[PDB]
Swiss-Prot record, chain A:
Protein family membership: Belongs to the universal ribosomal protein uL24 family.
Record keywords, A-Z: Cytoplasm, Ribonucleoprotein, Ribosomal protein
Name used for this protein in its record: Large ribosomal subunit protein uL24A
Cellular component, GO, one term: cytosolic large ribosomal subunit
Main location: cytoplasm
Subcellular location: Cytoplasm
PANTHER family noted in UniProt: 60S RIBOSOMAL PROTEIN L26 FAMILY MEMBER
Other notes: There are 2 genes for uL24 in yeast.
GO biological process: cytoplasmic translation; ribosomal large subunit biogenesis
Biological role stated in the UniProt entry: Component of the ribosome, a large ribonucleoprotein complex responsible for the synthesis of proteins in the cell. The small ribosomal subunit (SSU) binds messenger RNAs (mRNAs) and translates the encoded message by selecting cognate aminoacyl-transfer RNA (tRNA) molecules. The large subunit (LSU) contains the ribosomal catalytic site termed the peptidyl transferase center (PTC), which catalyzes the formation of peptide bonds, thereby polymerizing the amino acids delivered by tRNAs into a polypeptide chain.
Curated annotation (Swiss-Prot), chain C:
Protein's name according to its UniProt entry: Large ribosomal subunit protein eL13A
Lineage, highest ranks first: Eukaryota, Fungi, Dikarya, Ascomycota, Saccharomycotina
Family: Belongs to the eukaryotic ribosomal protein eL13 family.
Gene name per UniProt: RPL13A
Binding partners and assembly: Component of the large ribosomal subunit (LSU). Mature yeast ribosomes consist of a small (40S) and a large (60S) subunit. The 40S small subunit contains 1 molecule of ribosomal RNA (18S rRNA) and 33 different proteins (encoded by 57 genes). The large 60S subunit contains 3 rRNA molecules (25S, 5.8S and 5S rRNA) and 46 different proteins (encoded by 81 genes).
Record's signal peptide: none
Swiss-Prot record, chain F:
Alphabetized Gene3D superfamilies for the sequence: 2.20.25.30
Cross-referenced InterPro entries: Ribosomal_eL37, Ribosomal_eL37/eL43, Ribosomal_eL37_CS, Ribosomal_zn-bd
A Pfam entry, by short name: Ribosomal_L37e
Protein name: Large ribosomal subunit protein eL37A
Cofactor note: Binds 1 zinc ion per subunit.
Localization per Swiss-Prot or TrEMBL: Cytoplasm
Swiss-Prot record, chain G:
Oxidoreductase is among the record's keywords: no
InterPro entries in alphabetical order: Ribosomal_eL39, Ribosomal_eL39_CS, Ribosomal_eL39_dom_sf
Organism of this sequence: Saccharomyces cerevisiae (strain ATCC 204508 / S288c) (Baker's yeast)
Name of this protein: Large ribosomal subunit protein eL39
Gene: RPL39
Main location (coarse class): cytoplasm
Length: 126, 119, 99, 207, 71, 87, 50
RNA sequence: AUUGGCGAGAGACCGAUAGCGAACAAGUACAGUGAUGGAAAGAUGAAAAGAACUUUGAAAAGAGAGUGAAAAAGUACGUGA
RNA sequence: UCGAAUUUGGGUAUAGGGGCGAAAGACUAAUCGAACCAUCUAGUAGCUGGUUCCUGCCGAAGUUUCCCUCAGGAUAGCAG
RNA sequence: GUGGAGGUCAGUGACGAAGCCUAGACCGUAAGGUCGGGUCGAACGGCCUCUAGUGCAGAUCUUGGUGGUAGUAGCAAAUAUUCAAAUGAGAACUUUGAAGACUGAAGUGGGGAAAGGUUCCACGUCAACAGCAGUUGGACGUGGGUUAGUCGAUCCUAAGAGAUGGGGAAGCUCCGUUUCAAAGGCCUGAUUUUAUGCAGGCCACCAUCGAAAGGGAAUCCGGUUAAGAUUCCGGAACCUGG
RNA sequence: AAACUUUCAACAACGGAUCUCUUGGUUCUCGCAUCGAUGAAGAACGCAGCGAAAUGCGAUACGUAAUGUGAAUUGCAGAAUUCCGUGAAUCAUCGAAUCUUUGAACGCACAUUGCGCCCCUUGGUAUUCCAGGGGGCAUGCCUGUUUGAGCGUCAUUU
């Protein structure tokens, strides 16, 4: 249950805040859980998805397909994975939008800021 | 591309003026080429570089004037704080804290004592 | 109009009374605010007891002179008899009434 | 809103123009022009007898009658047939009223509070809750009233030593001090027979 | 406008709506190192200002336009 | 002839654009805006004209300066600048 | 009037530049709900009143 | 005290002819010389995957083929009196 | 009728119980025996119209007295 | 019988909730309830209670939608069209040619003022619009186009409007336009790093706004564009200030 | 007998009711006090590679600077990909600036993008004419400064 007077349970306010969230807030909203291997290797549960991460689809018709993120398309709350596409009738390939909550992160794109974030969350960072 | 403000801030007044003139010449050439090209998205970078150079030149000029007026009465109004019209009208801390020494003697002799009730 | 056997009523509602209807929806909210204000003031003036000592006085009129009640403040004669000045009594939490 | 349906300068055209006498929007050139206004029968008009804030909302009840109803509800909690009819799965409870040791008042964790309730027999009632959870039927589901469920047991203590926070997250389970004993909790929906689990100190303090 | 460049020795510019004929003359001389014979101005129906700058006989407006970059 | 033939004679203008409110309510011969009251110092408004007040009131424009007052107050009308360099 | 003030000419210039159909790429934007220029003004239908 | 401003939390309230006039580029379009008057208008699909290709037609389009869980969802788009 | 008490453009002045009128209560933006706009205002109406599901039981009055009362009320009667 | 609320049936449901259609079935005197079939796609019931913005055939009711009338009235003023070719899917209506007519110089011609605002011109182009039609268009889409010392404005004052001094008005403001006001700028001395120093009078005119037909400094001819010209080009002049 | 008319059903129309939905409204409660001559509210015009709006902004024009975050924006194009970084972003934050023409609106005026004056400076031979750049010139009132007026008036001086 909810205890603080600074937080609201209004569904209308929650949905307005979600749909009008700016890009920086959408970064956090688009978080993906780590795989078992990375969870053991890093000691953390979920991270905000990045463009060069490697992911595995665990839900939907594309479940089981691996790949690398190609775009974190924050404007429509979706990520695009290379080699996960739909083939249109006119020979063209179109990326398929996926939600990071339905993915799992298998290999993490790392730099100074990501490593600092992992340690800030309590990551061993093998 | 585009210039960087922290890099401009190490340059002197004349170097910045020369850079501004060069950027305006480059913008003129780009505006000429735009009439021939279907799209020239590179004009935006040069425009923003011009804006940044003007910002740094203004910063140096205003800081020099602040140095001239440092530690003296009657600063220029654009260099004075712009809190609010009513806030600038309001009495200063010293003026608001002025008391007659009849009241100063009263306050000194009989301040609000702190006390506790036992039971 | 007048009909049947009913008492004569005097409902004063011939002005624009609906413009000046006060409903105390905020009774609970203001009780909470008063309790918060008291807690804040107690913390601010701690350990002072949040209210001055008041004298005992006789209520006026024939209807209430059988009762005593708290007055505004002690008289200057009462403070002098107790052995302190009015200025100091006001600083140590005694309400003083000069009139 | 007090001004709803009246933000208009509409006047009746009167008779003689083969139209109803309703006040009509003046001017021209928009489509709203010449339309009926101000009437409860009119689209965009003012409703009949607009709702007022000074409608009576709270109802005064005599203190003695409130205590009468609370006492009756408490006595109804000790009738096995009333609790069963009210809807609690007390068919296998040893005895009603159900009194457990005062050790329950000091239980800190939700896990052990639930284990204690299941040990003393509230497992079926707890399972009836969180199995009865349903989406609300109607428009209340987007007025912050999305989900409905059944009420579970009410645990009555004498001194809060962690039992309230231990049972706070358990669905349907309510907690109460003997000093208060809300009638809303004792007879939900005005139906007597709340399933109540007493601590020993609470049971003694009832006198 | 491009016919005027060679058929009349006239350059056609879009200019600031705040500029007058003296300013246009001074600006053209400064920017392009030419001597100006005359400046004719009008306000276009789109709210911008167009200037016909006839250069002197000592400068070929087509050569100036080539140096500037257009055509 | 007070109708259609008389309407054919409407080719003057009683009102032109007002410099203050930009509305084409500047009465030419009275030299007064019928909407905003220009050139009077005060802006024309009436309590019986609640809709007109709503049409021209604060917040219906840009609030070029006033829109930042709430942020400046909430930060306390601070002066100077933020310090830390970079991460 | 063929003898017009600059203020009138400036208003006419703004109206001329506004008199255009909706750009086509607008319709392809994510969550677009604009289907046409609803403020389209023509000289034969509605007068702009100075 | 507070039908204004700013920041919050709520409801046995209304649910697109309702609720503010305005859920949408609404005090907008539009009317009037002017003061002023002042609308209508939300919903494809999880995803455009918005129908490649063939054929008839000047073309719109039709007929196939195909996409889709559904075209008894084709942008004249939920249901469809 | 047509060389003047002529016709007419533009500018300008007069504003609502006010103007203007070779005077018709004419005209004053299709509005005139008091313009138009908004507000008071959901103005008042003994007067016209309407007033939304079923079944069951009982079941009238248009008469008395008073009223600037006579298309309305009070009053008694009839009814539940 | 309807919207919402407390409780309960650990009620129904993407294996199909709600809604809608159904001369298909059942229950109730009735208000109504229930079931099957079709369509559909996301929520919804029974019971006990609570609550109301709770039930429509009418109000020349409100808003919206739709009929019969009815392929009906009407598209009959302004003398009037015809042949051929081209283009085009398509020609009574577009283009060209030929012919027949009309306006008949207080024009159906050539320009302008107010007003409009791009309607001008070109290219593409016909879903809507054009009293039929349309390949055409003042339509639609995209662009191009308005060049001044001399033409106007700008200056002057007209009937008027209107600050200031001052007076009135609770006040929004009103009067008044030179008034009961201490209401200003000309020449000359000028060492021209540089602007002044004292000179001696000079009317007493009181701000300002008010005319694209009144007053008023000065430009013509020829040529030139798809569309500009007393404005551009060529030539030939003139005025003002210095 | 058909046609026609009428009734019912199925399918197809017309139309947009019903059901479900909801970034909107409405009401109640709580907290806070902050517009403007340092030029507000409001108005006009303009600014984007490709925008008519809405939103944002002001010739530094969907923005500059600073701070945080830490890799986007997205309809297309373009660019970036040294992205393990003083660094993407129509991000957030915001304390430095810019802020056209206006507006109480302030040189005068304004149905004009009209007409002046003062200081510094530059160019045209130039204190005087013309032009460009920068900075200025409203009213009432207050305190003070300076220069004054009045046989209002004091003393001293011809
Ligand atoms: Mg329902
Ligand atoms: Mg010109
Ligand atoms: Mg007039
Ligand atoms: Mg017309
Ligand atoms: Mg509505
Ligand atoms: Mg609407
Ligand atoms: Mg719909
Ligand atoms: Mg289906
Ligand atoms: Mg469908
Ligand atoms: Mg449909
Ligand atoms: Mg005669
Ligand atoms: Mg009339
Ligand atoms: Mg009147
Ligand atoms: Mg009425
Ligand atoms: Mg009967
Ligand atoms: Mg009658
Ligand atoms: Mg039927
Ligand atoms: Mg169904
Ligand atoms: Mg769905
Ligand atoms: Mg009702
Ligand atoms: Mg009906
Ligand atoms: Mg013909
Ligand atoms: Mg046609
Ligand atoms: Mg043409
Ligand atoms: Mg066109
Ligand atoms: Mg002239
Ligand atoms: Mg003049
Ligand atoms: Mg011509
Ligand atoms: Mg010539």
């Amino acid at each position: 249950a909810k205890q603080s007077l600074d937080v609201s349970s209004d569904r209308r306010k929650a949905r307005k805040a979600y749909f009008t969230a700016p890009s920086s807030q959408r970064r956090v909203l688009l978080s993906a859980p780590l795989s078992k291997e990375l969870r053991a290797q890093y000691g953390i549960k979920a991270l905000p998805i990045r463009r060069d991460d490697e992911v595995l689809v665990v839900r939907g018709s594309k479940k089981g397909q691996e790949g690398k993120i190609s775009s974190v398309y924050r404007l429509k709350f979706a990520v695009q994975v290379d080699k996960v596409t739909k083939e249109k009738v006119n020979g063209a390939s179109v990326p398929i939008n996926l939600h990071p909550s339905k993915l799992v992160i298998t290999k993490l794109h790392l730099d100074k800021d990501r490593k600092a974030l992992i340690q800030r969350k309590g990551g061993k960072l093998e | 591309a585009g210039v960087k403000a922290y890099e401009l801030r190490t340059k002197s007044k004349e170097q910045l003026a020369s850079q501004l003139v060069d950027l305006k010449k480059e913008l003129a050439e780009l505006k000429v080429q735009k009439l021939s090209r279907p799209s020239l998205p590179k004009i935006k970078t040069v425009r923003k570089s011009i804006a940044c150079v003007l910002t740094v030149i203004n910063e140096q000029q205003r800081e020099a004037v602040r140095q001239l007026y440092k530690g003296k009465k009657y600063q220029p109004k654009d260099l004075r704080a712009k809190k609010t019209r009513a806030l600038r009208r309001a009495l200063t801390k010293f003026e608001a804290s002025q008391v007659t020494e009849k009241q100063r003697k009263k306050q000194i002799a009989f301040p609000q004592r702190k006390y506790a009730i036992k039971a | 109009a007048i009909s049947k056997n009913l008492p004569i009523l005097k409902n004063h509602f011939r002005k624009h009374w609906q413009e000046r209807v006060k409903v105390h929806f905020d009774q609970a909210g203001k009780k909470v605010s008063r309790r918060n204000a008291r807690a804040t003031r107690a913390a601010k003036i701690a350990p002072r007891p949040l209210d001055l000592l008041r004298p005992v006085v006789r209520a006026p009129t024939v209807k209430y002179n059988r009762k005593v009640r708290a007055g505004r403040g002690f008289t200057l004669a009462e403070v002098k008899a107790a052995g302190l000045t009015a200025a100091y009594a006001r600083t140590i939490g005694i309400a003083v009434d000069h009139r | 809103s007090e001004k709803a349906g009246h933000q208009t300068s509409a006047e009746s055209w009167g008779t003689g123009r083969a139209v109803a006498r309703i006040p009509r929007v003046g001017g021209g050139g928009t489509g709203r022009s010449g339309q009926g206004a101000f009437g409860n029968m009119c689209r965009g008009g003012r409703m009949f007898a607009p709702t007022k804030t000074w409608r009576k909302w709270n109802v005064k009840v005599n203190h003695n009658e409130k205590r009468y109803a609370t006492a009756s509800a408490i006595a109804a909690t000790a009738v096995a047939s009333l609790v069963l009819a009210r809807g609690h799965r007390v068919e296998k409870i040893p005895e009603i009223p159900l009194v457990v040791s005062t050790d329950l008042e000091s239980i800190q964790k939700t896990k052990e509070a639930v284990a204690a309730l299941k040990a003393v027999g509230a497992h079926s009632d707890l399972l009836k809750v969180l199995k009865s959870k349903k989406l609300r039927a109607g428009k209340g589901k987007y007025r912050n009233r999305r989900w409905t469920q059944r009420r579970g047991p009410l645990v009555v203590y004498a001194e809060d030593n962690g039992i309230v926070k231990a049972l706070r997250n358990v669905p349907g389970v309510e907690t109460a001090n003997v000093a208060s004993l809300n009638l809303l909790q004792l007879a939900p929906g005005a139906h007597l027979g709340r399933f109540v689990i007493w601590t020993e100190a609470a049971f003694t303090k009832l006198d | 406008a491009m016919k005027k460049v060679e058929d009349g020795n006239i350059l056609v510019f879009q200019v600031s709506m705040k500029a007058n004929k003296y300013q246009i003359k001074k600006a053209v001389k400064e920017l392009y190192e030419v001597d100006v014979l005359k400046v004719n101005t009008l306000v276009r129906p789109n709210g911008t200002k167009k200037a016909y700058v006839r250069l002197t006989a000592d400068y070929d407006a087509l050569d100036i336009a080539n140096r500037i970059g257009y055509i | 002839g007070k109708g259609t033939p008389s309407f054919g004679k409407r080719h003057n203008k009683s009102h032109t654009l007002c410099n203050r409110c930009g509305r084409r309510s500047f009465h030419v011969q009275k030299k007064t805006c019928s909407s905003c009251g220009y050139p009077a110092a005060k802006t024309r408004s009436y309590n019986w004209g609640a809709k007109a007040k709503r049409r021209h009131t604060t917040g219906t424009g840009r609030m070029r300066y006033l829109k930042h007052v709430s942020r400046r107050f909430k930060n306390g009308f601070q002066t100077g600048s933020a310090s830390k360099a970079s991460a | 009037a063929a003898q017009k003030s600059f203020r009138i000419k400036q208003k006419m210039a703004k109206a001329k530049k506004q008199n255009r159909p909706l750009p086509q790429w607008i319709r392809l934007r994510t969550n677009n709900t604009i289907r046409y220029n609803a403020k389209r003004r023509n000289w034969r239908r509605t007068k702009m009143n100075i």
